[PDB]
Design an enzyme around this catalytic site. Structure first.
Site, mmCIF file in Angstrom:
data_model
loop_
_atom_site.group_PDB
_atom_site.id
_atom_site.type_symbol
_atom_site.label_atom_id
_atom_site.label_comp_id
_atom_site.label_asym_id
_atom_site.label_seq_id
_atom_site.Cartn_x
_atom_site.Cartn_y
_atom_site.Cartn_z
ATOM 1 N N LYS C 22 0.875 -1.146 0.000
ATOM 2 C CA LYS C 22 0.000 0.000 0.000
ATOM 3 C C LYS C 22 0.924 1.210 0.000
ATOM 4 C CE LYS C 22 -1.172 1.875 4.623
ATOM 5 N NZ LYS C 22 0.248 2.211 4.940
ATOM 6 N N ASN C 23 2.164 1.000 0.422
ATOM 7 C CA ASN C 23 3.089 2.115 0.481
ATOM 8 C C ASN C 23 3.495 2.597 -0.893
ATOM 9 O OD1 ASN C 23 2.833 2.045 3.275
ATOM 10 N ND2 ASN C 23 4.836 1.068 3.661
ATOM 11 N N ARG C 91 -2.324 10.652 6.028
ATOM 12 C CA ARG C 91 -1.221 11.487 5.625
ATOM 13 C C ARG C 91 -1.129 11.596 4.098
ATOM 14 N NH1 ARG C 91 3.955 10.108 9.737
ATOM 15 N NH2 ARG C 91 2.803 10.451 11.679
ATOM 16 N N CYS C 115 0.483 23.648 16.092
ATOM 17 C CA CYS C 115 1.571 24.634 16.225
ATOM 18 C C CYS C 115 2.849 23.980 15.687
ATOM 19 C CB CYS C 115 1.791 25.056 17.694
ATOM 20 S SG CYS C 115 0.303 25.255 18.754
ATOM 21 N N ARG C 120 5.977 20.105 10.964
ATOM 22 C CA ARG C 120 5.173 19.719 9.798
ATOM 23 C C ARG C 120 5.867 19.252 8.512
ATOM 24 N NH1 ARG C 120 0.581 23.841 8.117
ATOM 25 N NH2 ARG C 120 2.555 24.730 7.357
ATOM 26 N N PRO C 121 5.809 17.946 8.220
ATOM 27 C CA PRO C 121 6.450 17.471 6.991
ATOM 28 C C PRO C 121 5.815 18.036 5.704
ATOM 29 C CG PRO C 121 6.450 15.758 8.579
ATOM 30 C CD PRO C 121 5.533 16.821 9.127
ATOM 31 N N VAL C 122 4.574 18.510 5.783
ATOM 32 C CA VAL C 122 3.948 19.068 4.586
ATOM 33 C C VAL C 122 4.668 20.337 4.108
ATOM 34 C CG1 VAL C 122 1.718 18.180 5.329
ATOM 35 C CG2 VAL C 122 2.301 20.560 5.734
ATOM 36 N N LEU C 124 7.793 20.695 3.428
ATOM 37 C CA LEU C 124 8.669 20.334 2.327
ATOM 38 C C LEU C 124 7.932 20.212 0.995
ATOM 39 C CD1 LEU C 124 10.698 17.726 4.327
ATOM 40 C CD2 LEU C 124 11.655 19.785 3.233
ATOM 41 N N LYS C 160 16.121 17.509 4.217
ATOM 42 C CA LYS C 160 15.760 16.293 4.928
ATOM 43 C C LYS C 160 15.352 15.269 3.877
ATOM 44 C CE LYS C 160 12.360 18.023 7.234
ATOM 45 N NZ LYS C 160 11.207 18.361 8.142
ATOM 46 N N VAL C 161 15.818 14.034 4.001
ATOM 47 C CA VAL C 161 15.436 13.006 3.037
ATOM 48 C C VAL C 161 13.984 12.695 3.327
ATOM 49 C CG1 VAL C 161 15.752 10.637 2.308
ATOM 50 C CG2 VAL C 161 17.736 12.021 2.950
ATOM 51 N N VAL C 163 10.371 10.858 2.036
ATOM 52 C CA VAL C 163 9.609 10.003 1.146
ATOM 53 C C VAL C 163 8.434 10.758 0.549
ATOM 54 C CG1 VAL C 163 8.088 8.007 0.991
ATOM 55 C CG2 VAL C 163 10.216 7.862 2.277
ATOM 56 N N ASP C 305 11.333 -0.772 9.626
ATOM 57 C CA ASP C 305 10.016 -1.403 9.680
ATOM 58 C C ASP C 305 10.039 -2.894 9.912
ATOM 59 O OD1 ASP C 305 8.644 0.857 9.458
ATOM 60 O OD2 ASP C 305 8.005 0.631 7.374
ATOM 61 N N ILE C 327 18.050 4.959 13.289
ATOM 62 C CA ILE C 327 16.951 5.762 12.754
ATOM 63 C C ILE C 327 16.063 6.284 13.888
ATOM 64 C CG2 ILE C 327 15.155 5.859 10.962
ATOM 65 C CD1 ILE C 327 16.263 3.389 9.684
ATOM 66 N N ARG C 397 -4.979 -2.017 8.948
ATOM 67 C CA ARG C 397 -4.730 -0.930 8.020
ATOM 68 C C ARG C 397 -3.528 -1.165 7.140
ATOM 69 N NH1 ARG C 397 -4.901 5.152 9.860
ATOM 70 N NH2 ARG C 397 -4.681 5.223 7.584
HETATM 71 C C1 TAV Z 1 6.538 7.566 5.286
HETATM 72 N N1 TAV Z 1 6.401 8.901 5.927
HETATM 73 C C2 TAV Z 1 5.106 9.520 6.221
HETATM 74 O O1 TAV Z 1 4.888 10.075 7.297
HETATM 75 C C3 TAV Z 1 4.038 9.475 5.163
HETATM 76 C C4 TAV Z 1 3.124 8.416 5.093
HETATM 77 C C5 TAV Z 1 2.157 8.412 4.084
HETATM 78 O O2 TAV Z 1 1.494 7.014 4.019
HETATM 79 S S1 TAV Z 1 1.503 5.398 3.958
HETATM 80 O O3 TAV Z 1 1.480 4.916 5.350
HETATM 81 O O4 TAV Z 1 0.555 4.959 2.959
HETATM 82 C C6 TAV Z 1 3.163 5.208 3.274
HETATM 83 C C7 TAV Z 1 3.389 5.588 1.889
HETATM 84 C C8 TAV Z 1 4.627 5.439 1.331
HETATM 85 C C9 TAV Z 1 5.730 4.902 2.091
HETATM 86 C C10 TAV Z 1 7.043 4.729 1.510
HETATM 87 C C11 TAV Z 1 8.073 4.212 2.253
HETATM 88 C C12 TAV Z 1 7.864 3.830 3.639
HETATM 89 C C13 TAV Z 1 6.623 3.979 4.238
HETATM 90 C C14 TAV Z 1 5.514 4.519 3.478
HETATM 91 C C15 TAV Z 1 4.190 4.689 4.055
HETATM 92 C C16 TAV Z 1 2.056 9.465 3.158
HETATM 93 C C17 TAV Z 1 2.965 10.519 3.226
HETATM 94 C C18 TAV Z 1 3.971 10.531 4.231
HETATM 95 N N2 TAV Z 1 4.946 11.562 4.374
HETATM 96 S S2 TAV Z 1 4.566 13.149 4.061
HETATM 97 O O5 TAV Z 1 5.774 13.921 4.306
HETATM 98 O O6 TAV Z 1 3.858 13.243 2.770
HETATM 99 C C19 TAV Z 1 3.411 13.581 5.392
HETATM 100 C C20 TAV Z 1 2.143 14.183 5.008
HETATM 101 C C21 TAV Z 1 1.207 14.548 5.946
HETATM 102 C C22 TAV Z 1 1.458 14.347 7.344
HETATM 103 C C23 TAV Z 1 0.477 14.725 8.346
HETATM 104 C C24 TAV Z 1 0.739 14.520 9.679
HETATM 105 C C25 TAV Z 1 2.002 13.923 10.106
HETATM 106 C C26 TAV Z 1 2.970 13.546 9.176
HETATM 107 C C27 TAV Z 1 2.733 13.743 7.761
HETATM 108 C C28 TAV Z 1 3.715 13.361 6.734
HETATM 109 C C29 TAV Z 1 7.284 9.089 7.117
HETATM 110 C C30 TAV Z 1 7.081 7.975 8.253
HETATM 111 C C31 TAV Z 1 7.748 8.273 9.648
HETATM 112 O O7 TAV Z 1 9.117 8.529 9.688
HETATM 113 O O8 TAV Z 1 7.070 8.292 10.691
HETATM 114 C C32 TAV Z 1 8.772 9.296 6.642
HETATM 115 O O9 TAV Z 1 9.656 8.199 6.831
HETATM 116 O O10 TAV Z 1 9.170 10.319 6.092
#
Ligand code: TAV
Ligand code: TAV
Ligand code: TAV
Ligand code: TAV
Lengths: 419, 419, 419, 419
Positions: C22-23, C91, C115, C120-122, C124, C160-161, C163, C305, C327, C397
């Protein structure tokens, strides 16, 4: 104060034979103290620390002689105290401690006399040996480690990943009673080569190269022949020498599998690369390199020791590229020297943003870091005009005749005296 | 396996008398080994480690007897070896080493433990004493220290800030020839109290509480009386008890100036706070606490030992708040247990985002960390229903019968046996 | 509140068919908004977030239908505002922004309230779109990205790297004028899959899977058929299931090259492994696993993971093994739950020292983390007696019919209602 | 390219009058945009950024004139767009955004925008104003902000401590409806000065100098007079000038309480220090300074801006001292330059081991960092012979007439042109 006067620009192309990595030879030579029968260690470079090591061994009672290889007869080691005079000159001295206690029940080596407590890298070795059951005495600035009978295998968890401690503990363990496990062991190819050397002598070791090494102590170790692995950083230096000057080079006596990250990164830079069992060729087909993104990290990832060289590659490449040091710090000091040669770069944190330019300009430069310095020499080779790299002894201690190898690839270079 | 069964919700209110901090009593008790005449150490809690300490001291030839205070006579210490079967039970054991060597010229403390190289507290003690002039020996599972004449004042640079080593070096330095300077010294109130105790015995110390301590060695230390400072964490625990239950409480036998960060943080939560020379009062005036932002950091900043309790506070507060831990890596094992009690929280690295809820639900919970455990007990006091906190011995070793104190505040709590 | 009741011990063996990740499905589905002709996305799991994604897209005017694959017809998207109620649930909602602005010159999404300025990762994603030339509007807790004409290619340096941002920037760049370069790009297999999906539709992308992605904007993207890559984490969970139960299993519809680190580590555990083009088999030959040393790091290194699962493997393994997490600082919330089941372990910072036992005991456990929770279900399968894992919706999920696949491997498991 | 030619060795002694801190004047000047009646800002140095700020303010319609102080009449600001060529020269330009939006409901500032995503420091200013209710619009390489009615007080959590953002948020909040709380606010003395300035105009602020600032919005701010605080870094530079030259000096117009950590550090170096209400005196009594241990950290701790100066102090002091940088990883570019002057030092990570030498030798040096460079001029003053510090414009930007002040202490220095 010797230095290198270089004239550019010159395309660096042809061939180079890669020397044996001193980073592997050093730990191997000290490991040799465990050998009861004669040992022929092949492919050892001729550098200051190798001479120093040979002297230190000889002063411990071991018969030593060299050329391309170093012959060792440690059948009669009868002195177990490494002299301060030789020890003070190099970090590798500490490695004489473990073998002596493991094989002869006692070893004494002087320690650095700073002021800071709980940092001295040397401390892991002492505690590592204690874990194996050695009695430790800390007095008058030295360490006297000994044991009644054999050492005992132990399960050791390394808190910090240490190349040095991994070697001490692993080497000592080969003669202990039982099994020793080292968790979070250094993974470097040089560790792997030392492991392989010990195995060649009769030791029981597996997992080298991984996060945990397992040693099964044996009665004693024999002798034999072993060849030190090629210097992967020297290899990288020259591949970059061809990669930044539109050249084509073939590195002989090389070991491709120790450079997966570097090779891949050169291809991303646009290099046309072919590898054999013991050679690597790189062809730019007369083109400038393409800027790359680099992230240094623990082996087998991109090596920090190749960083200054790729930084240079990006500074003369097509486009922008950022080199990130994820592990170390204050590592981009050679960068301001390059800027003085006309490079465009910004240092921001553990990062250096590189903006490639057409040509660098000769200038007077200097760098204390071995690799940073070799980079300044390659920079001089493709720079417009005359470049003078000072304090090149830093390079001499790590590279075997770099000028002769560079000259053979087309460089106009001359070593000079007088400060 | 004792445990606490709690019935909630209850408004915790009234008064509580804060006990002496065992964290100051322990280092002081061992420091007493330096005292040539009788010493009365007042305000010593009755806890396991205190008993062990009393037995260890006696075993060394010191005359010990207790009640509210511990009366010590070390005039006749005549055995310098801390037996393994008395040391293995507590870290504090290591503090007997420095005083014995400094006053009697020799000592040894059994060294339990096993794994973890590099990060092996005690390493710092060993090298600290060596820097003060002692010869260290590690054999037979013992850490042994000897010295010729007195220890020599030395200028020592602590690479890592360490409470334990600071105590060892500072205590031992009081009897050394010359001045000893400790750079990057632990700054905790308990270090300050130990310094003051030593000064009360005739020692010359200044700078306690700051980055650097300076000790001027004296011939010998006498005797006298000294009162152990109040447990600032126990105080924080009860202030939070009231802050999260709409209650009112007065903490007696407290020392306000050891809690500027914690008191400031509670006012931010909306607590109405009043302080005296030896007391602190807190009134919520029946209101829910307001969510706060917390960042644990080195003293005098907010203390990591109050972190779990404040996580609880945010979890039952109005709004969202973020707990940030700049001191301990994984110090959030309280978070999952709280979630099972109905708390809304997200862990994100060295952070926990808290979403306060109106109320928590009783549940069976357990935590190994002393403070995380005490927080679970508090959680149960304000959660709806029955809560059972298992393995409460973690709390018993650090809090003087918390169940009696809590009950006097209104709590319905029972200690129960049978696993 | 659904939960899993597991009866142990049972050896898990046989075959399992790996669902699509699903990822990778999520980013691909949103990428599909860029397709001008119909797209068939095969191998999409039936999970909560997929339903939400289909609903969201439908609300934008795209025609969506599904089964084993999802059909997408975005030829007529006419509403460019992602509704708050659908967006608040996941997300991945953020991924609708870039495509909408890149293909239609406008997109609007709601953002996380609160706040934590800087967190906020959004951010980026927003700043990334701004670099590509989008006009940004930040009002009333949401974003409006819009562009007059096409976005323009830009050289972007990720600090920041990420995804998520890599996906947003990479997807939007496929329709921009000129070249886009993303330095420090996420390297995950799922990013590589999204890149390949875009390419399949006519995009020009290269470097996916490396530190820098280069995109060459094109007029428009077509349609087609693409199959989502296998879930490498589901795969690893099942390999471990066999690996910790003396089992033997074959994973079908798998992709071996996304698990180099995981397969190697399982071999170190003593697992006999063979792989094919689309399958992986693992056989313990009725043996207990041997403890391993693990160090989580960025792909292609061992995945964080898979960490919870390998912790379980060590806890029932032969010997001691430490799992270091370089990590996610915090991430061992499952350990306490495993301890209750009888495991012997210590948490030491970003590390967990594991001491394998021969048999675990059934108990009532719960974990919020998806992977940690699936580990508990595995633990229950090899534990003595009955195990009840609560709050299994976390598993529902991220795993497609886990109870059905486990049962097929021989597990005794059943889902139960009532809190 | 101007540069300084220095003649050593000279004993710097006498007196120096400390200038106003440009780091306080800049935020204050922009805050003056909120003033409805004329304001006299006293004690403002004459530096490039001040001139630039005056021109920018003038463009906005504010009447500006200056000398020792800068008089401001913003009663008639009627243009709310900071032009690009007027902004591109300094970071401080961003401070014009918040006041404009807070007082006039609208403003826009031209944006830099090179690379570094999720690292562009202006993000915090942006998100800060958005939390206060402002609409943000990014387009035309501008950051446009506007608001309906007044800004609305909000509770803001700063993820990263940020001097600049603290100023934008705090300043704008003075005119917002209600209360604003900034968590994790920058605590620098310049923030406190800016708070007091706004308070002087009629603002309601408290907590400045601490972790959380609270602002209570008012209708409007009037005018008046305010004296910019002394340059604590300039002060520190001069105290070091005397301390490393056996000198004695009295700093007039100083503010001792902004230098606790620096003064304490100098006492440790052996300096005899006395302070008054607005002056500080330092006497070395003709003695060399002693080596010290330094660890930079967030104010009130030792300042990173004094780090290069203290590095120089150690390098000419008696003994060994290690300097540690926990703020700026590469703030060591001055060492290579100092070594060239004969100092003995080793860099190792965020650290520099210093070994004091009796005297330094003149040489040609250059440093891009303002403070590192000022240190080279000091090294030149006590060096043997003639030192030439190039590209001294860096010093000109941050120090007011350093030559004139240095000359009056006894230095032999002369400014020169021609590259
Ligand atoms: C993966 N990432 C996220 O937070 C993340 C998860 C999403 O959804 S999933 O579960 O379908 C998914 C999709 C693709 C993946 C690829 C590789 C590994 C795991 C995956 C999981 C979809 C987008 C994400 N990142 S983001 O920057 O747009 C994003 C967008 C909105 C948010 C709102 C609140 C808090 C955090 C947020 C992060 C984080 C996970 C973490 O470190 O906690 C990251 O590693 O950067
Ligand atoms: C490599 N290491 C060292 O400090 C190091 C270098 C030595 O000698 S060499 O030059 O022949 C050599 C040998 C093997 C190598 C393998 C991979 C990479 C580089 C190598 C270099 C030999 C031992 C070393 N490490 S150690 O723990 O026993 C050691 C021993 C004595 C010391 C004395 C003063 C200060 C530091 C010391 C460290 C450091 C290097 C660093 O600080 O970045 C590390 O991070 O591990
Ligand atoms: C304080 N420290 C310890 O581990 C510690 C606790 C001791 O005993 S106490 O309980 O009376 C005490 C005393 C003073 C305190 C001051 C502030 C906060 C808490 C305190 C607790 C006594 C000595 C200690 N540290 S030490 O280096 O000599 C030490 C000595 C022997 C050991 C043996 C095995 C493993 C670890 C050991 C550590 C740790 C505490 C932690 O890890 O949370 C630290 O990291 O600083
Ligand atoms: C101060 N800060 C800055 O980068 C900074 C410096 C400025 O100008 S100054 O030179 O007149 C000044 C003013 C006040 C000071 C207070 C204490 C210490 C030093 C000071 C220096 C003005 C604004 C700044 N920060 S900011 O977030 O609005 C900002 C604004 C615009 C930018 C444009 C391009 C790149 C970076 C930018 C950063 C940093 C400095 C650092 O990174 O250590 C910080 O501590 O946050």
């Amino acid at each position: 104060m010797d230095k290198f006067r270089v004239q550019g620009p010159t395309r660096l192309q042809g061939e180079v034979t890669i020397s044996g990595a001193k980073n592997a030879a050093l730990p191997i030579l000290f490991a040799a103290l465990l050998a009861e029968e004669p040992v022929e260690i092949q492919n050892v470079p001729k550098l200051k620390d190798i001479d120093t090591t040979m002297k230190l061994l000889t002063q411990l009672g071991t018969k030593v002689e060299r050329x391309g290889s170093v012959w060792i007869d440690a059948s009669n080691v009868n002195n177990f105290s490494a002299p301060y005079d030789l020890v003070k000159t190099m970090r590798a001295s500490i490695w004489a401690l473990g073998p002596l206690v493991a094989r002869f029940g006692q070893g004494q080596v002087s320690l650095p006399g700073g002021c800071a407590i709980g940092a001295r890298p040397v401390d892991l070795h002492i505690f590592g040996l204690e874990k194996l059951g050695a009695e430790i005495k800390l007095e008058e600035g030295y360490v006297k480690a000994s044991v009644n009978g054999r050492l005992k295998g132990a399960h050791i968890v390394m808190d910090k990943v240490s190349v040095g401690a991994t070697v001490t503990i692993m080497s000592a363990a080969t003669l202990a009673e039982g099994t020793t496990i080292i968790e979070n062991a250094a993974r470097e190819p040089e560790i792997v080569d030392t492991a392989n050397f010990l195995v060649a002598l009769g030791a029981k070791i597996s997992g080298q190269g991984t996060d945990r090494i397992t040693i099964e102590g044996v009665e004693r170790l024999g002798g034999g022949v072993y060849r030190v692995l090629p210097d992967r950083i020297e290899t990288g230096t020259f591949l970059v020498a061809a990669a930044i000057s539109g050249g084509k080079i073939v590195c002989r006596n090389a070991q491709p599998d120790t450079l997966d990250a570097v090779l891949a990164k050169l291809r991303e830079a646009g290099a046309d690369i072919e590898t054999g069992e013991d050679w690597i060729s790189l062809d730019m087909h007369g083109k400038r390199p393409k800027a790359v993104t680099v992230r240094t990290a623990p082996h087998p990832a991109f090596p920090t020791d190749m960083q200054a060289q790729f930084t240079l590659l990006n500074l003369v490449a097509e486009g922008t590229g950022v080199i990130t040091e994820t592990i170390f710090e204050n590592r981009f000091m050679h960068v301001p020297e390059l800027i003085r040669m006309g490079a465009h770069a910004e240092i921001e944190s553990n990062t250096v943003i590189c903006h490639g330019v057409e040509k660098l300009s000769g200038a007077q430069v200097m760098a204390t870091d071995l690799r940073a310095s070799a980079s300044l020499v390659l920079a001089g080779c493709i720079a417009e005009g005359t470049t003078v790299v000072d304090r090149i002894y830093h390079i001499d201690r790590g590279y075997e005749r770099i000028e002769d190898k560079l000259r053979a690839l087309g460089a106009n270079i001359e070593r000079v005296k007088g400060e």
